[PDB]
Amino acid sequence: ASEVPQVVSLDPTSIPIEYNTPIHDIKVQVYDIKGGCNVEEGLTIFLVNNPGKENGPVKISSKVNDKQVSEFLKDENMEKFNVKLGTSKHFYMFNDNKNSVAVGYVGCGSVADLSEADMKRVVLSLVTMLHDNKLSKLTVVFEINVDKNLFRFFLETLFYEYMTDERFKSTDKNVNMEYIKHLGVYINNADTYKEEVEKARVYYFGTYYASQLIAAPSNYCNPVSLSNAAVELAQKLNLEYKILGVKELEELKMGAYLSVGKGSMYPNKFIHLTYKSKGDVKKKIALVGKGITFDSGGYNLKAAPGSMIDLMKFDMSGCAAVLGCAYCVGTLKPENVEIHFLSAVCENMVSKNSYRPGDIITASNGKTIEVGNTDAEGRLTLADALVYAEKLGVDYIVDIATLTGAMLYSLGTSYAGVFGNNEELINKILQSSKTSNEPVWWLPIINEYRATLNSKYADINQISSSVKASSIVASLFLKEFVQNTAWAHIDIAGVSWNFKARKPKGFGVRLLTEFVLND
Amino acid sequence: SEVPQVVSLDPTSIPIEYNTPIHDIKVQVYDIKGGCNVEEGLTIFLVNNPGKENGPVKISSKVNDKQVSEFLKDENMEKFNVKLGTSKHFYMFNDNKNSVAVGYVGCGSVADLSEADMKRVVLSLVTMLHDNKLSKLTVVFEINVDKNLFRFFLETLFYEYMTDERFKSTDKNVNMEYIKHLGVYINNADTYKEEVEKARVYYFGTYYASQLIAAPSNYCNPVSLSNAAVELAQKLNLEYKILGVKELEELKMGAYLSVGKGSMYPNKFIHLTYKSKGDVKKKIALVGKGITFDSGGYNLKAAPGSMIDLMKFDMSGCAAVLGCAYCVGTLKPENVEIHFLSAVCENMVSKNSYRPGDIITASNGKTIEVGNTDAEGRLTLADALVYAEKLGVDYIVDIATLTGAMLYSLGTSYAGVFGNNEELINKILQSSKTSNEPVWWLPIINEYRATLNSKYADINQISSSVKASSIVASLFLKEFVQNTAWAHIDIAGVSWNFKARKPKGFGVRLLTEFVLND
Amino acid sequence: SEVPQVVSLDPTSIPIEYNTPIHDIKVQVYDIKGGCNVEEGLTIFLVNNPKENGPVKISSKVNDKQVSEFLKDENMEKFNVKLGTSKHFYMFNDNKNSVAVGYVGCGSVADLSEADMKRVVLSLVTMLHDNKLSKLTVVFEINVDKNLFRFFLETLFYEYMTDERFKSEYIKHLGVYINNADTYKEEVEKARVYYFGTYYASQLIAAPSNYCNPVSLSNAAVELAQKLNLEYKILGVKELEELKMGAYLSVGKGSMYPNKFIHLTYKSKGDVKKKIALVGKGITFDSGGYNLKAAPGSMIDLMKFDMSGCAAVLGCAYCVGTLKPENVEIHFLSAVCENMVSKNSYRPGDIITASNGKTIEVGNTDAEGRLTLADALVYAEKLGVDYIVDIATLTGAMLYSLGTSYAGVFGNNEELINKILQSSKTSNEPVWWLPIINEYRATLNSKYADINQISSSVKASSIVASLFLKEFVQNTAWAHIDIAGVSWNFKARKPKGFGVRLLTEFVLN
Numbered sequence A: 001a002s003e004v005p006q007v008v009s010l011d012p013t014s015i016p017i018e019y020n021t022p023i024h025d026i027k028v029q030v031y032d033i034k035g036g037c038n039v040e041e042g043l044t045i046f047l048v049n050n051p052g053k054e055n056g057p058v059k060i061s062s063k064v065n066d067k068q069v070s071e072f073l074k075d076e077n078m079e080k081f082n083v084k085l086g087t088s089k090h091f092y093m094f095n096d097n098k099n100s101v102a103v104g105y106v107g108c109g110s111v112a113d114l115s116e117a118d119m120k121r122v123v124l125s126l127v128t129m130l131h132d133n134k135l136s137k138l139t140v141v142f143e144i145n146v147d148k149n150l151f152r153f154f155l156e157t158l159f160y161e162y163m164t165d166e167r168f169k170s171t172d173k174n175v176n177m178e179y180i181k182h183l184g185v186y187i188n189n190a191d192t193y194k195e196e197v198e199k200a201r202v203y204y205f206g207t208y209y210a211s212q213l214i215a216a217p218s219n220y221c222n223p224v225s226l227s228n229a230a231v232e233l234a235q236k237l238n239l240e241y242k243i244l245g246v247k248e249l250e251e252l253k254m255g256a257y258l259s260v261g262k263g264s265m266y267p268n269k270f271i272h273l274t275y276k277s278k279g280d281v282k283k284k285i286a287l288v289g290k291g292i293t294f295d296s297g298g299y300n301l302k303a304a305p306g307s308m309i310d311l312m313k314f315d316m317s318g319c320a321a322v323l324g325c326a327y328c329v330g331t332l333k334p335e336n337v338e339i340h341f342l343s344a345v346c347e348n349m350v351s352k353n354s355y356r357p358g359d360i361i362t363a364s365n366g367k368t369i370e371v372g373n374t375d376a377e378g379r380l381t382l383a384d385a386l387v388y389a390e391k392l393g394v395d396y397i398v399d400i401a402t403l404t405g406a407m408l409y410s411l412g413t414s415y416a417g418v419f420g421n422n423e424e425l426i427n428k429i430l431q432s433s434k435t436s437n438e439p440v441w442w443l444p445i446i447n448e449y450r451a452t453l454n455s456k457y458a459d460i461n462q463i464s465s466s467v468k469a470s471s472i473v474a475s476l477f478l479k480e481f482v483q484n485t486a487w488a489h490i491d492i493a494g495v496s497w498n499f500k501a502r503k504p505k506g507f508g509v510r511l512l513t514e515f516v517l518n519d
Numbered sequence B: 001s002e003v004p005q006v007v008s009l010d011p012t013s014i015p016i017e018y019n020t021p022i023h024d025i026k027v028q029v030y031d032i033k034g035g036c037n038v039e040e041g042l043t044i045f046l047v048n049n050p051g052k053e054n055g056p057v058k059i060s061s062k063v064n065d066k067q068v069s070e071f072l073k074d075e076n077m078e079k080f081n082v083k084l085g086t087s088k089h090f091y092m093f094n095d096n097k098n099s100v101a102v103g104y105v106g107c108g109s110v111a112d113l114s115e116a117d118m119k120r121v122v123l124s125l126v127t128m129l130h131d132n133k134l135s136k137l138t139v140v141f142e143i144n145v146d147k148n149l150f151r152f153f154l155e156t157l158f159y160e161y162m163t164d165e166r167f168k169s170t171d172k173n174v175n176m177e178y179i180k181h182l183g184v185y186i187n188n189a190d191t192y193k194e195e196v197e198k199a200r201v202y203y204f205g206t207y208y209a210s211q212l213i214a215a216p217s218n219y220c221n222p223v224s225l226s227n228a229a230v231e232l233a234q235k236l237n238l239e240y241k242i243l244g245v246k247e248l249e250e251l252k253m254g255a256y257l258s259v260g261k262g263s264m265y266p267n268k269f270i271h272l273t274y275k276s277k278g279d280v281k282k283k284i285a286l287v288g289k290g291i292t293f294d295s296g297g298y299n300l301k302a303a304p305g306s307m308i309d310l311m312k313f314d315m316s317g318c319a320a321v322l323g324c325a326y327c328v329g330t331l332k333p334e335n336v337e338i339h340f341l342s343a344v345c346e347n348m349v350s351k352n353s354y355r356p357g358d359i360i361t362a363s364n365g366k367t368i369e370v371g372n373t374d375a376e377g378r379l380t381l382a383d384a385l386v387y388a389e390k391l392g393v394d395y396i397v398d399i400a401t402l403t404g405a406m407l408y409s410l411g412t413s414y415a416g417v418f419g420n421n422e423e424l425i426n427k428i429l430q431s432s433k434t435s436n437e438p439v440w441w442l443p444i445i446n447e448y449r450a451t452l453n454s455k456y457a458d459i460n461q462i463s464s465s466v467k468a469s470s471i472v473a474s475l476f477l478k479e480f481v482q483n484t485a486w487a488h489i490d491i492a493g494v495s496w497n498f499k500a501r502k503p504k505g506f507g508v509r510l511l512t513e514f515v516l517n518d
Numbered sequence C: 001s002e003v004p005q006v007v008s009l010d011p012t013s014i015p016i017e018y019n020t021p022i023h024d025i026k027v028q029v030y031d032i033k034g035g036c037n038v039e040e041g042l043t044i045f046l047v048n049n050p051k052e053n054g055p056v057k058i059s060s061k062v063n064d065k066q067v068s069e070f071l072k073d074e075n076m077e078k079f080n081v082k083l084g085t086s087k088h089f090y091m092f093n094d095n096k097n098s099v100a101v102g103y104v105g106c107g108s109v110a111d112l113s114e115a116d117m118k119r120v121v122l123s124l125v126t127m128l129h130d131n132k133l134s135k136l137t138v139v140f141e142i143n144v145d146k147n148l149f150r151f152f153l154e155t156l157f158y159e160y161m162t163d164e165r166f167k168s169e170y171i172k173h174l175g176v177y178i179n180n181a182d183t184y185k186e187e188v189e190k191a192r193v194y195y196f197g198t199y200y201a202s203q204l205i206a207a208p209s210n211y212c213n214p215v216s217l218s219n220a221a222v223e224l225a226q227k228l229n230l231e232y233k234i235l236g237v238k239e240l241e242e243l244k245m246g247a248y249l250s251v252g253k254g255s256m257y258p259n260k261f262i263h264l265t266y267k268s269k270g271d272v273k274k275k276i277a278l279v280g281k282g283i284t285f286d287s288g289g290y291n292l293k294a295a296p297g298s299m300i301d302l303m304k305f306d307m308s309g310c311a312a313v314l315g316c317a318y319c320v321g322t323l324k325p326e327n328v329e330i331h332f333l334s335a336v337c338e339n340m341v342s343k344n345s346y347r348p349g350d351i352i353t354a355s356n357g358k359t360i361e362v363g364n365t366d367a368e369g370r371l372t373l374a375d376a377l378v379y380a381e382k383l384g385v386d387y388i389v390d391i392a393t394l395t396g397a398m399l400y401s402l403g404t405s406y407a408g409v410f411g412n413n414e415e416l417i418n419k420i421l422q423s424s425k426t427s428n429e430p431v432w433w434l435p436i437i438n439e440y441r442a443t444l445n446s447k448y449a450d451i452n453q454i455s456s457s458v459k460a461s462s463i464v465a466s467l468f469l470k471e472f473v474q475n476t477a478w479a480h481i482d483i484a485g486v487s488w489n490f491k492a493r494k495p496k497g498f499g500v501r502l503l504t505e506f507v508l509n
């Protein structure tokens, strides 16, 4: 652990991290619907749909072990309500033991197969029922068809969206902040879904942990304070760790990554976490995350309209995703696999010491790079991290980065883009996208654009001249730093931040973890 | 002299190639009378056809080889035309049954090839040298050229042929093999032979400047650039002096010192001196703008089209001046003393940077209000010009990448020259013709001077009302020359070749021709 | 000839003032030797001090004792000669009549430029606008040659005159004391002619585009021709179509006003030894077309000024028609139209054919000037003249090259260019020679048309445009004057009428 440099004594010297969240205090019980539903304290919510019939009437088909509640929820009483996706209603009644209970439903539309996006709409409606209501318990009755993954995704999203980050609140803490202590789930074939519960809780926190890092402002989350948090995480998970400082970075000749950080008051820190199975290692993997704790753009300052320089604390989202994945892996402990978690962390600032547009810098594999734009710094840091990664001698290298703003014009805010040099690896990323329900789409590395990276003086240009297809050109650049290893690149510049909700998504954590686990 | 680093991987000197493959090319000039020997390598005829736009090629000169002569008959050459820029390759066997490669380059129908047209001919020729491993090139001039233009042909051939690979490591051209011999057949070879070594000298001066310019700002900084100058001065036995901050403070160069304040690299003032052996009749001060990187300062280059990634080229004036010092120091003209000056610094954004609105005091006591930190060139030049005049010279000439407006007035081919003395300006225009580096005389319109009147300082750095920044900047510069013939050359538009993505080394030959023929 | 209207309140002609109060001013020129009489009105001494911001000192003997006492060294040294600084005082003379006496500083340089002289006059005019005076007397205690003296009068007349045509008492006597008065007296009535030529052009330029449109501008040209007994011909769309002027006709397609080609002719009585065509750009309003002037700084509200070239030419025709030079034939030409946005407008990308058969690819509809000039130059050369001179508000880049004081001149002939430069010297309308760089010509090579209207990127727009126009003059001495920068006086919010005196001097000499 290094000392975080301060300008004034009021500068914070660590990232506040909440490990023990109220979500971890929730006891989850899973019951089979065949046994009938018991309705007592708290809130009991039925998830209902009506196949084919858009905005069709609500029907409760589950057995309810209470004559009063059963009478209330009979068809004739429910037909005035419809199943419009996201619709919710609260019911109030007395049960067979003369106790007042709260019941209700969330409409799940008229399609039996709910997409990952429509399921998020269902959960958000459910969360609005949790907010502003001091409840001790919530019960959920699944009257829709969900597979194991979508069930887990439901729980993960519930936990994530229910949670409220108050680390930076001082005088504006919510006085009515109270969480349930109990969560009941009624679902058919309950014994097959039980295994998903703790997995979801693990995936929730891995995702929530990343979110905390991303949301943490750059005066809290800087290269030293972020690497320090990585150390603390490794210590709690019994992961091996190594933080490389400028001296060793110099010895390794990482000129590209070092030049990006030259302008910052915070020394570069290269994070290297390792998980190894106790069993014989049958596959080795490196996960590489972009780790810019703040990206001012450098001398190519973000001063253009729509550049959102105030969002630039998000620029270590790739690193956050990787560290979030480290939590999940170190907790679930997969067998026969060795995983490296890597991030070349730095800050891209303006200074007398900054690297300049036009500078020629040498990467750790000896390639000279001409810098055409100081704000294209991510691919420079990744270049050295990718060289470092391949020297580990692994089977797959997967990187994840808020790399290019062009992603918002190509895939937008919902789907991440994946590029690569190996088809089998890309299919596996796409497969893990399905089973994690973190949407990713395969995008091409167009070789014809490679020629536009031909530098007159250096071995290669940092950015293209023609093109404008930045996401693809950046992928071309990165590919030049991976010689003979299966490699994939996940651009999350578009999906990292939830603009509507004004919070990080913790995107990529579940995706990467599913990738590690399912092979 | 010691180059500060942020990290140990930061370079501490500019890589400079002094002996180039071009220097290893043995050059022989033969007279066209007595015919041409075609025996080895690639023989190229430069042909014309005055009259018809694209008339047939007609090889006039005698070829001392029966087989080669039969091939180059008018009958066989009829299908090929003389369009300016075109070229063809030929394969055949000579008299002793040895395979030989012949060809031609079209020089158009016009009997007078201009600076731009000759450049086009050279390019066509260089294309033939590329992607073809040749031990020898022979060029037969079946067109007419003056002696300056012949020198210009060789200069341009040498400059364009040479490839800068100082910053390649994993991607050097493996097929890069230069010729070792160059043959030239031309009429009255006795007179043209003198231009050969003059061309080689002018070439390296230009290429030396180009190397400094192309060098990125992390390699090329105020300390390393001034070290490079010192090394140059040493190889040439020029007197040299590098003024550091402490000296500059004593001289009270507050305008120049302000510009480098935000930089990690200390300011360094380059003062080189050549003196003729005998009686000195003319004293000349050459001043180069030497900003090793121009970020704009707090007036950051952030506007569309400001091309901040090119601003390593903002020391081109200094490079021109140092390049001239090479030529002058090598050619050793008589009856002249020349001072090569450059206020070298770096314009950066920092807690220590000078600010828009700052009032600073030049070394001649004039207080200056800063309106824009990106108009830093004229601030450094101000102190440099005051220093220059204190040397008591006859002519002060500054050269600078000073105003972007030049791209809208003269464009990328012609530099602008401004001045306070018509005689000096005429000499610059004369030097432009003989060096074939095109310059156009632009006026210093005194009506715009009132817009440099400041409410609080003695003078404004920039105008607020008048556009035409090239003229306004000239007006500002004129305020720091009291009673000396002075001229100013703005090369902001011509310094960088945007199409070839490389510098031109513009100004080297111009300044040298100015020196030599005074 | 009938001006179309959208509503009945639309103006159907340009209001023009022919008889100005300047024409009522009686000018007397006296020699400074013999002393100056100060009997009435305002008397102003033009004074320098060759030092900087030095004290005022009056050298001329004044034949009035009271005023002499006022003008004594001890009193005037309280004031300084800083360029454009002025003081004037009211007092009683020997006859106990009210007189005003004062000065205007002319700085510390023995030779005033046209810019300096202008500042002097502006200070003089300020006093005239603030005082009710029947008479102004100006005493020259500075050195001025014949041309600069005429320039002084022209400038004085022009700046003094106030255009009130669109709104809803001048001096009657000008006295001038100057050493060697006799050599200067002939400059007076020439200055009056140059004044109105300049002011007439100013009137056309300042007239908004709803008053000044292609139809009313040509109608005004006709009326001018009739008053001066100049031959005149106005070419309409049918005539222009037959002449295959496709470049020029394309620009006006989107306008509600039919294109009008103005062709005025002055012919001397005797043998014609020189034939000259003067071509003025006549865009009555330039919106930019589909390449609309929408960018910040494009100043679309100024774009009534885009016929300043035509105005300069018509102002010259007044001077030439008045002074009647001998042994010359002058053609006054303008392809007048309006560049507008409409379903009918020409489009960026359109390939259009000029009257010499050259196909043109339009890259920017706001570069419309060179298109109208393309067909005007072709028309001009067919007249078989010795010189073609065009003048035009052609490129905004002129503001970045020479600025607002000097116009640029481009050409294909050295003799012609140096004639314009000499005319610039004698008219004191500053012009600077700029190169037509042949290396830039290749940027106008089109993939589909014979030539490009504009370059994709050469940035040197004034030069690229000049190259374009050069392609439409095949074997005649031709020069192009780009007055886009100098035509409008931004500070004074009015035209300069730039080019009238320049072009007239070119014709007369």
Ligand SMILES: CC(C)(C)C(=O)N[C@@H](C(=O)NO)c1ccc(-c2ccsc2)cc1
Pocket: A295, A297, A307, A308, A311, A373, A375, A376, A377, A378, A402, A403, A404, A405, A406, A408, A470, A493, A494
């Ligand atoms: C502007 C360009 C092409 C250099 C780019 O892709 N910039 C990146 C960047 O600064 N990388 O270091 C960029 C710009 C904007 C975003 C972004 C994403 C959501 S809002 C702004 C993300 C990446």
Ligand SMILES: CC(C)(C)C(=O)N[C@@H](C(=O)NO)c1ccc(-c2ccsc2)cc1
Pocket: B294, B306, B307, B310, B372, B374, B375, B376, B377, B401, B402, B403, B404, B405, B407, B469, B492, B493
């Ligand atoms: C922006 C302005 C008017 C202050 C100016 O003249 N800038 C100079 C400059 O920064 N001088 O120190 C300038 C701007 C752009 C260029 C340029 C030249 C080729 S591309 C950009 C050159 C000089």
Ligand SMILES: CC(C)(C)C(=O)N[C@@H](C(=O)NO)c1ccc(-c2ccsc2)cc1
Pocket: C286, C298, C299, C302, C364, C366, C367, C368, C369, C393, C394, C395, C396, C397, C461, C484, C485
């Ligand atoms: C469109 C461009 C940049 C080629 C140009 O120079 N346009 C001309 C024009 O509209 N010609 O028809 C132009 C633009 C601006 C001005 C101008 C002059 C004083 S303020 C703006 C003048 C001419």
Ligand SMILES: [Zn+2]
Pocket: A295, A297, A374, A375, A376, A377, A378
């Ligand atoms: Zn960036």
Ligand SMILES: [Zn+2]
Pocket: A292, A295, A315, A375, A377, A378, A402, A403
């Ligand atoms: Zn970034």
Ligand SMILES: [Zn+2]
Pocket: B294, B296, B373, B374, B375, B376, B377
């Ligand atoms: Zn600058």
Ligand SMILES: [Zn+2]
Pocket: B291, B294, B314, B374, B376, B377, B401, B402
């Ligand atoms: Zn500069």
Ligand SMILES: [Zn+2]
Pocket: C286, C288, C365, C366, C367, C368, C369
């Ligand atoms: Zn226009």
Ligand SMILES: [Zn+2]
Pocket: C283, C286, C306, C366, C368, C369, C393, C394
């Ligand atoms: Zn126009």
